[PDB]
Design a protein around this nucleic acid. Structure first.
Ligand SMILES: [Zn+2]
Length: 271
DNA sequence: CTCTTTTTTCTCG
DNA sequence: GCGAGAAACAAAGA
């Protein structure tokens, strides 16, 4: 998932598990807890969920008085709230059991990660990750954004995917953002003029906030959290190869940029 | 059966 | 440090 999807999951979790006391924690794939599963099990069992936050694409469980469980869903991670008697599913790896139900984490590719740290280690953790600003008008400063773009020869799509210029963009929204801003994914950032950088800046914020509003892009997913999204119906280019651009009518093309599938309109996004 | 396709971080030169 | 390619891992399609 990307920022919008993670935020959707965050909101659902906040509304449903905050105030819940963890009865037990079990794992069929303990190796995904980078800080040690048995240690996390011992530390969190019996503690209560106080809140759920997010930074970039990272989900943050606030548990007990000073515990912070950092979860990254990577490519296919999915959470679901199920009954205590719910049958096990092939790719379920961890479960946080409460008195009236359980939170199950599943990940087909096993990329997702869990890390238990303390409240005062959160900010340092993200500084070490070098995560850029949240995609909001208040946090995403266009001036710094512009100076970083003017300094680099990197291609705009790969640079945006780094999470350093701004946090939250993944393959879907980076493609949607560049199409909206009329910028070709291979454009070297030092070649972007001020007006283009301004449109890009605003497009990043607008696209992601719209995606959040629509519950993210859900393309399937069972009863998993954040699976009722409607943003997928607003996608203009991602996965639209062969279809016609809604603005000019040209056929959306798909190429490979820095190893990633890339969808764009050759007319609207001049190289 | 082989090759390709679908977030983060490291290896290699 | 930087770009290119790939690995972690699983499944579905050509
Ligand atoms: Zn177009």
């Amino acid at each position: 998932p990307e920022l919008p999807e993670v935020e959707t999951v965050r909101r659902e979790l906040e509304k449903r598990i905050v105030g819940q006391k963890i009865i037990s924690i079990e794992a069929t794939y303990p190796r995904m807890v980078l800080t040690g599963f048995e240690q996390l099990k011992k530390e969190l069992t019996g503690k209560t969920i106080q809140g759920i936050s997010r930074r970039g694409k990272y989900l943050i469980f606030e548990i007990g008085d000073d515990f912070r469980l950092i979860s990254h869903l990577r490519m296919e991670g999915k959470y679901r709230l199920a009954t205590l008697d719910a049958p096990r599913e092939k790719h379920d790896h961890l479960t946080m059991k409460f008195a009236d139900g359980q939170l199950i984490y599943a990940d087909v590719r096993k990329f997702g990660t869990w890390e238990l740290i303390s409240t005062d280690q959160v900010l340092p953790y993200f500084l070490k990750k070098k995560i850029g600003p949240e995609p909001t008008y208040e946090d995403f400063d266009e001036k710094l954004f512009r100076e970083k773009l003017r300094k680099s020869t990197k291609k705009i799509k790969p640079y945006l995917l780094e999470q350093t210029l701004v946090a939250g963009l993944g393959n879907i929204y980076v493609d949607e953002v560049l199409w909206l801003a009329k910028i070709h994914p291979e454009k070297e950032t030092n070649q972007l003029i001020e007006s283009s950088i301004h449109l890009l800046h605003d497009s990043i914020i607008e696209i992601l906030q719209k995606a959040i509003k629509l519950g993210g892009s859900s393309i399937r997913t069972y009863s998993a959290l954040g699976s009722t999204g409607k943003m997928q119906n607003e996608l203009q280019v991602y996965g639209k190869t062969g279809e016609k651009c809604s603005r000019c009518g040209a056929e959306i093309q798909k190429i490979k940029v820095a190893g990633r599938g890339t969808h764009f309109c050759p007319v609207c996004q001049q190289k």
